[PDB]
Amino acid sequence: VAPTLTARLYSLLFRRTSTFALTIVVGALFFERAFDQGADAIYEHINEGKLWKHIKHKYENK
Amino acid sequence: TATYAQALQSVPETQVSQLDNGLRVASEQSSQPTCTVGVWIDAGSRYESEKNNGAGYFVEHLAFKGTKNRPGNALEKEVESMGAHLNAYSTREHTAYYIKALSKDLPKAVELLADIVQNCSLEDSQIEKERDVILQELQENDTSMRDVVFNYLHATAFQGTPLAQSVEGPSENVRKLSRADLTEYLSRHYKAPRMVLAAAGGLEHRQLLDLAQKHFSGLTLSPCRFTGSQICHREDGLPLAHVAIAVEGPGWAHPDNVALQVANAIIGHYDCTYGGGAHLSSPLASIAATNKLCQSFQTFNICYADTGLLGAHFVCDHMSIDDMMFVLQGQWMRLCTSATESEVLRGKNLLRNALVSHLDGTTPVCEDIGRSLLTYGRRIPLAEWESRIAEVDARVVREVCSKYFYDQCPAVAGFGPIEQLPDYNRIRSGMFWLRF
Amino acid sequence: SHTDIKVPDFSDYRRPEVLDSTKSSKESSEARKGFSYLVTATTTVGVAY
Amino acid sequence: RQLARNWVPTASLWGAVGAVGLVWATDWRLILDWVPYIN
């Protein structure tokens, strides 16, 4: 039997205070970069042809 | 001559001898006219059922009330006619029977001891006497807050297993016991391997083994639960509040069993009337005395078969109780990171100083053997202890406490006037530093 | 005198990995407890966002 | 004395963190896209 990630991760990170805090400080970076991107479509995928991002393709670069 | 290096070499060693029915023999020569004979029994309170609780205790009393062959108080007169001191004692795991005596009267001793080991006069003459005597005691035992607070702590974590229960058990079974269960519990647990026999004094082994002398010996445990919790009995009358704190630990046999010995050597301990003064090296011993944040404190270490206990026991006035608790913890925590070699030396020295001084007098060696056999068996790693001690390193330590302390779940044992005791969740978020 | 006190069980409060008195807490403790702190960290993430 | 223990690594571990913070804050530079970076 092998320790589930938690047993590992706790021994890995949460135990040592910084280490615990460290990945916490890490996670948000990629997160928001991933988060900001992934959500926008959900907004945008719903909003289609009503915005020059879609509209101005009619007249953009002439 | 004598050199602490040489002195480890010159020892009478422990002896090993077996019987057929499971009794073990053993011995060491003190070149002494006197000898301490004893008998050890591994029958634990945790073996007995809930109804069976307090029996052996009750039983232990019954032994010298006269035995099957030798009725009441003809027994004592002989040992008194000899002039020998006689004593016995109990513990949740272990019960003891032993005598200090000359090597001369040794032969009767065994055959006296042997008879009562199992053969027992069972008469209700005593059953009510002792019961009343015990009911006397049970109600009187409430006098010392010390022995009080312990049992709470066992039940605190070890609830769910017999390990936590009282030695003397509920007041009711004290009334409710028939000597059938006695004989029954006499029956089960007094056959070997459960039995262990030894003695120490001027006796060589063989002159023991001959008169180990044809009489007899004989024909379950579980992991106990370790529960983070609290117990609070608030009573405002008394002046002081005995408070101690603990976390579970390893079993008897283990390397870590060694490191923990020096662990408590670090903290030291302070009480009122020590000649210590402010100049003591131990941080709390000086400081907790400085403001007398404690009238007294000590530490404890006990390692069971599969279990062990770590912590300290302290006494202080109530209005300041918060102090000790605040200022106890770091003395664990600062170890866990910043600890130091030299500071251990003394403790390294102390434990060395400690175990050596343990060996004065006949009896103490005798007692050692029994637990040793019940614990590590034959082992008397005398010089090896030092080697076991020489093991120790600053890293070694800062590896150990890493296990059992940093961010763990303690249990809380306390007795009135608890009132100002910091609440639980502090202690928990107070165990692990945030780095301050 | 009393010596008898105890609460029968907290089971309905209590939880699976500790559900046996004959099991060592050291067994579950590592992974079990980490699950606790686990809530601490992730919940701080959105705070930063 | 000085025995400068895991604290030194601990210390080594502290400042590393918030160093990211600035970069993560709003007063850092533009690293190699390194997981999505819009133009």
Swiss-Prot record, chain A:
The organism is Bos taurus
The membrane topology noted for this protein in its Swiss-Prot or TrEMBL record is: Single-pass membrane protein
Described function: Component of the ubiquinol-cytochrome c oxidoreductase, a multisubunit transmembrane complex that is part of the mitochondrial electron transport chain which drives oxidative phosphorylation.
Main localization (coarse): mitochondrion
Where is this gene product found? Mitochondrion inner membrane
Q: Which residues lie on this side of the membrane: Mitochondrial intermembrane?
A: 47-62
- Biological process (GO), any one: mitochondrial electron transport, ubiquinol to cytochrome c
Which keywords does this Swiss-Prot/TrEMBL entry list?
A: Electron transport, Membrane, Mitochondrion, Mitochondrion inner membrane, Respiratory chain, Transmembrane, Transmembrane helix, Transport
Per the UniProt record, which residue ranges are transmembrane?
A: 21-46
Pfam families, A to Z: UCR_UQCRX_QCR9
Q: Which residues lie on this side of the membrane: Mitochondrial matrix?
A: 1-20
Task: Kindly give the PANTHER family that the UniProt entry links to this protein.
Answer: CYTOCHROME B-C1 COMPLEX SUBUNIT 9, UBIQUINOL-CYTOCHROME C REDUCTASE COMPLEX, SUBUNIT X
Designated name of the protein = Cytochrome b-c1 complex subunit 9
Q: How does it assemble?
A: Component of the ubiquinol-cytochrome c oxidoreductase (cytochrome b-c1 complex, complex III, CIII), a multisubunit enzyme composed of 11 subunits. The complex is composed of 3 respiratory subunits cytochrome b, cytochrome c1 and Rieske protein UQCRFS1, 2 core protein subunits UQCRC1/QCR1 and UQCRC2/QCR2, and 6 low-molecular weight protein subunits UQCRH/QCR6, UQCRB/QCR7, UQCRQ/QCR8, UQCR10/QCR9, UQCR11/QCR10 and subunit 9, the cleavage product of Rieske protein UQCRFS1.
Q: Which family does it belong to?
A: Belongs to the UQCR10/QCR9 family.
Classification via SUPFAM superfamilies: Subunit X (non-heme 7 kDa protein) of cytochrome bc1 complex (Ubiquinol-cytochrome c reductase) (SSF81514)
Swiss-Prot record, chain B:
Q: Which residues carry this modification: N6-acetyllysine?
A: 77, 104, 129, 214
Q: Which residues carry this modification: Phosphoserine?
A: 178
- Please provide the record's keywords in A-Z order: Acetylation, Electron transport, Membrane, Mitochondrion, Mitochondrion inner membrane, Phosphoprotein, Respiratory chain, Transit peptide, Transport
Keyword Phosphoprotein attached:
yes
InterPro entries reported in the protein's UniProt record: Metalloenz_LuxS/M16, MPP/UQCRC_Complex, Pept_M16_N, Peptidase_M16_C
**One family name in Pfam for this protein:** Peptidase_M16_C
Q: Which GO MF terms are attached to this record?
A: metal ion binding
Which intervals of the chain form a coiled coil?
none
- One GO cellular component, as annotated: mitochondrial inner membrane
Which residues are recorded with the post-translational modification N6-succinyllysine? 129
| Similarity field | Belongs to the peptidase M16 family. UQCRC1/QCR1 subfamily.
Q: Please give the name of this protein.
A: Cytochrome b-c1 complex subunit 1, mitochondrial
State the organism of origin.
Answer: Bos taurus
Originating gene: UQCRC1
UniProtKB/Swiss-Prot annotation, chain C:
| Domain of life the protein comes from | Eukaryota
Q: Where are the transmembrane segments?
A: 26-49
What ranges does the Mitochondrial matrix topological domain annotation cover? 1-25
Q: How does it assemble?
A: Component of the ubiquinol-cytochrome c oxidoreductase (cytochrome b-c1 complex, complex III, CIII), a multisubunit enzyme composed of 11 subunits. The complex is composed of 3 respiratory subunits cytochrome b, cytochrome c1 and Rieske protein UQCRFS1, 2 core protein subunits UQCRC1/QCR1 and UQCRC2/QCR2, and 6 low-molecular weight protein subunits UQCRH/QCR6, UQCRB/QCR7, UQCRQ/QCR8, UQCR10/QCR9, UQCR11/QCR10 and subunit 9, the cleavage product of Rieske protein UQCRFS1.
Described purpose of this protein according to its UniProt entry: Component of the ubiquinol-cytochrome c oxidoreductase, a multisubunit transmembrane complex that is part of the mitochondrial electron transport chain which drives oxidative phosphorylation.
Q: What is this protein called?
A: Cytochrome b-c1 complex subunit Rieske, mitochondrial
Q: Which organism is it from?
A: Bos taurus
Gene behind this protein: UQCRFS1
Relative to the complete UniProt sequence, the shown stretch is: 79 to 127 of 274
UniProtKB/Swiss-Prot annotation, chain D:
Q: Which organism is it from?
A: Bos taurus
Which residue ranges are assigned to the Mitochondrial intermembrane compartment in the record's topology?
A: 26-39
Q: Which GO terms describe its biological process?
A: mitochondrial electron transport, ubiquinol to cytochrome c
Listed GO cellular component terms?
Answer: mitochondrial inner membrane; respiratory chain complex III
Family, per entry = Belongs to the UQCR11/QCR10 family.
> This protein is called what?
Cytochrome b-c1 complex subunit 10
**Membrane topology, record value:** Single-pass membrane protein
Q: Which gene encodes it?
A: UQCR11
Q: Which UniProt keywords apply?
A: Electron transport, Membrane, Mitochondrion, Mitochondrion inner membrane, Respiratory chain, Transmembrane, Transmembrane helix, Transport
The residue ranges crossing the membrane are 3-25
Does Transport appear among the keywords?
yes
* Assembly and oligomerization: Component of the ubiquinol-cytochrome c oxidoreductase (cytochrome b-c1 complex, complex III, CIII), a multisubunit enzyme composed of 11 subunits. The complex is composed of 3 respiratory subunits cytochrome b, cytochrome c1 and Rieske protein UQCRFS1, 2 core protein subunits UQCRC1/QCR1 and UQCRC2/QCR2, and 6 low-molecular weight protein subunits UQCRH/QCR6, UQCRB/QCR7, UQCRQ/QCR8, UQCR10/QCR9, UQCR11/QCR10 and subunit 9, the cleavage product of Rieske protein UQCRFS1.
Task: Establish whether keyword Acetylation is in the entry.
Answer: no
Parent protein range shown?
Answer: 11 to 49 of 56
